[PDB]
């Protein structure tokens, strides 16, 4: 037992982190097969960052302008291209540590592990959630761009995030592995504001199911509600609306505890309208929203 | 910026996890060089677990009773011995993925990363602290015994923990890699209670410095306290006392933020006496004590 914010084992991703340098700018890249993926602003200097014309800047670069390094070992760049905000550098060596992998674009509310790297060296790993406003409350410093977030299913690594930016409020922004930003953010040296954040409702429900599994069930009530009425109230309490996918992935926890999704939604609606009244859930007095139903299933059943 | 519970990258440890089976019991082992380390209760049956005479049980086993598996590859056991609660199985193959490593015993208040594994397959990694009562607030299920905790210094892995047991309260217990339990716990199948736990004060102070570095400073005040008066109040609230060494290691964070240590201690004393008033610090409604000063420095610099 015990419930912890848990990250995936990072070895498979560690085996793929490299160091990409253009001129004096050094950030991190992802070496899969014979291709290295990294943020394109590696080709920028400071004066270019303020308003960059990445096409014009890339036409001026050649293969021999890119220094790719695994450790201190150079990988020769034999091709280069730009896909949205991601630079793809074809190298001369296929990574022998390439795992089975996919590129996926996650939805707001999903979690993933971030491998914080600097100069191609992994420094840390932590668990993160894509907020409803398409930011992440990560932990990044200078030189962390190109660090990736990922999940692992069986032995297959699904890469979903590449880091690019820190907003003035201290949250972070990035793209998928196809270079498309999450949210309305652009890779420019500008102070950009995110929309107002909200609470991830499906994750709070997953946490309440985790409570019921461990005996904590004072918050259950008689009532049920329709999905639409619940979403209407939830938006009034700065909670995200619940999608059909959300109801579907809550299915296993509903079957394990015997509590239907809409019944638990009525329980949470009562919690939002009346409060907690001093009482606690899993010790905590705050409702936790960065555990997905998958995370609860993973820690309350064991997976891989 | 930002602050998260961060674990060390686990790849070097993943390269060493194997599956150890004796009879019907299967748990995890650590394969370093030509030796596999695992919890000794792998040799016990449900009958033995109540009051196991481990040396009698071990002398009755042979090399061929132990099935060591690296993924889908059998490792032939050519020796076996016992160091306290840890069984050491000598195999015929040296692990090529063996990193530079050390066996260390950590003190209460220190943190480490846990690689939770089942049947030799790593499933998760998270950050833990050795509680003052020598438990850890981990996340372990059946078959997780043999999972290890560790830190990493440049490229050297310091193994400090091997998991053995879950207490009735849901906290966890284990040994160092020399087989000596942390705390008054025993590897037998009984309900075992821990001593009263206290809060790691120096860690709370480091985490308040982390909160100041990341903008949160509603809890600060214009007051200052002496070390002894702060320790009086802290012990009143079941907090471990703050030593001069603790004050010194907070030095870098004090220099970075410009807040003296005793100034922050006045802030924390006000927090303990008054409460949070519904407010939060770094998204937490409770005072966090599982970040050492070094963890904060490493993350905020
Ligand atoms: C990549 N190495 C780096 C990582 C940042 C720095 C601190 N922690 C992080 O997460 N990324 C950047 O520095 C990016 C680069 C631009 C292409 C996006 N810039 C920012 O994150 C950035 C720039 C500003 C700014 O510029 C005037 C004003 C306010 C905030 C801000 N953030
Ligand atoms: C190892 N695979 C396993 C890991 C446990 C199971 C549940 N989660 C964990 O962390 N360890 C055990 O099962 C140990 C074995 C000990 C003999 C060394 N046993 C316990 O943790 C245990 C036994 C009891 C008990 O027995 C009557 C009563 C209450 C609690 C308890 N915990
Ligand atoms: Na003060």
Residue A188 lies in a domain: no
Quick one: which atom of ligand 1 is closest to the CA of A143? Answer: 2
Residue A186 lies in a domain: no
Method for structure elucidation: X-ray
Whole-number Å distance between alpha carbons of B255 and B238:
28
How far, in Å, is the centroid of ligand 1 from the Cα of A193?
Answer: 13
- Tokens of residue A105, six digits: 């674009």
Full residue range of the structural domain in which residue B240 is found: 201-299
Backbone angles phi, psi at A296, to 5 degrees: -60, -45
Whole-number Å distance between alpha carbons of B122 and A114:
17
Residue A155 lies in a domain: yes
Shortest distance, CA A56 to any CA of chain B (angstroms) = 32
Q: Do B7 and A126 touch (CB under 8 A)?
A: yes
User: Do A182 and A176 contact (CB within 8 A), yes or no?
Assistant: yes
Whole-number Å distance between alpha carbons of A6 and B12:
18
CB-CB neighbors (< 8 A) of B298 in chain A: 123
- Closest Cα partner for A36 from A177, A156, A153? A177
User: Do B205 and B265 contact (CB within 8 A), yes or no?
Assistant: yes
Residue A61 lies in a domain: yes
Q: Report the CATH number at residue A211.
A: 1.10.1840.10
Residue B60 lies in a domain: yes
- Mutation for testing the B interface, residue in A5, A7, A13 having most B CBs under 10 Å: A7
**Residues of chain B in Cβ contact (below 8 Å) with chain A:** 1-12, 14-15, 115-116, 118, 121-126, 137-143, 166, 170-172, 214-215, 280, 283, 285-286, 298-299, 301
Residues 6+ apart with CB under 8 A from A190: A50
Residue A7 lies in a domain: no
Environment class of residue A278 by beta-carbon count within 10 Å: exposed (0-12), middle (13-18) or buried (19+)?
exposed
- Tokens of residue B9, six digits: 């990258």
- Closest Cα partner for A182 from A243, A108, A253, A112? A108
Q: Do A125 and B171 touch (CB under 8 A)?
A: no
Ligand that comes closest to the CA of residue B223: 3
3-class secondary-structure state, position B257: helix
How many domains are there within chain B?
A: 2
Question: A222 with A292, same domain?
Answer: yes
Q: What is the DSSP letter of B196?
A: P
Quick one: which atom of ligand 2 is closest to the CA of B165? Answer: 21
User: Do A224 and A183 contact (CB within 8 A), yes or no?
Assistant: no
Q: What is the resolution of this structure in A?
A: 2.2
How far, in Å, is the centroid of ligand 2 from the Cα of B143?
Answer: 10
User: Do A301 and A285 contact (CB within 8 A), yes or no?
Assistant: no
Shortest distance, CA B280 to any CA of chain A (angstroms) = 10
User: Do B95 and B32 contact (CB within 8 A), yes or no?
Assistant: yes
Residues in chain B: 301
Q: Pick from A175, A193, A221: which residue ends a domain?
A: A175
Q: Do B6 and A116 touch (CB under 8 A)?
A: yes
User: Do A274 and A211 contact (CB within 8 A), yes or no?
Assistant: no
Q: Report the CATH number at residue A70.
A: 2.40.10.10
Q: In whole angstroms, how far apart are CA B237 and each of A246, B117, B201, B234, B241?
A: 43, 37, 11, 5, 10
The pairing of beta strand B156-166 with beta strand B101-103: parallel
In which region does residue B209 sit, left (phi positive, over 0), alpha (psi from -120 to 50) or beta (all else)?
alpha
Residue A116: other Cβ atoms inside 10 A: 24
Residue A5 lies in a domain: no
Gyration radius from chain B CA atoms? 22
Question: A66 with A120, same domain?
Answer: no
- C-alpha B272 chain-centroid distance: 26
Choose the closest CB to A9 out of B5, B122, B141: B122
Residues in chain A: 304
Residue A104, ligand 1, Cβ within 6 A:
no
Helix locations, B104-194, DSSP H? none
Q: Pick from A37, A65, A91: which residue ends a domain?
A: A91
- Closest Cα partner for B31 from B83, B85, B65, B71? B71
Give the side-chain half-sphere CA count within 13 A for B246: 19
How far, in Å, is the centroid of ligand 3 from the Cα of B197?
Answer: 27
Q: What is the DSSP string of A72-99?
A: TEEE-EEEEEEETTEEEEEESS--TTPP
Question: A218 with A281, same domain?
Answer: yes
Residue A217 lies in a domain: yes
Q: Pick from B91, B113, B139: which residue ends a domain?
A: B91
Q: How far apart are the first and last CA of chain A?
A: 16
Whole-number Å distance between alpha carbons of A68 and B92:
39
């Amino acid at each position: 037992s015990g419930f912890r914010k848990m990250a995936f084992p990072s070895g498979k991703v560690e085996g793929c982190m490299v160091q990409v340098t253009c001129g004096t700018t050094t950030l991190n890249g992802l070496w899969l097969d014979d291709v290295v993926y990294c943020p394109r602003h590696v080709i920028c200097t400071s004066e270019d960052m303020l308003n960059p014309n990445y096409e014009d800047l890339l036409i001026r670069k050649s293969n021999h302008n890119f220094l790719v390094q695994a450790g201190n070992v150079q990988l020769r760049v034999i091709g280069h291209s730009m896909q949205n905000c991601v630079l793809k550098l074809k190298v001369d060596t296929a990574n022998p540590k390439t795992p089975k992998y996919k590129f996926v674009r996650i939805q707001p509310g999903q979690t993933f592990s971030v491998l914080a790297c600097y100069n191609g060296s992994p420094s840390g790993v932590y668990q993160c959630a894509m907020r409803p406003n398409f930011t992440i409350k990560g932990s990044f410093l200078n030189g962390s761009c190109g660090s990736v977030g990922f999940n692992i299913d069986y032995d297959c690594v699904s890469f979903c995030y590449m880091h690019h930016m820190e907003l003035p409020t201290g949250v972070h922004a990035g793209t998928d592995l196809e270079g498309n930003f999450y949210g309305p953010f652009v890779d420019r040296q500008t102070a950009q504001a995110a929309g107002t954040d909200t609470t991830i409702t499906v994750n709070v429900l997953a946490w309440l199911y985790a409570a019921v599994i461990n005996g904590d069930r004072w918050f259950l009530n008689r009532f049920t509600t329709t999905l639409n009425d619940f979403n209407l109230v939830a938006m009034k309490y700065n909670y995200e609306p619940l999608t059909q996918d959300h109801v579907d992935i809550l299915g296993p926890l509903s079957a394990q505890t015997g509590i239907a999704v809409l019944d638990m939604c009525a329980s949470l609606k009562e919690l939002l309208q009346n409060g907690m009244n001093g009482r606690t859930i899993l010790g905590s007095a705050l409702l936790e929203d960065e555990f997905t139903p998958f995370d609860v299933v993973r820690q309350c059943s064991g997976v891989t």
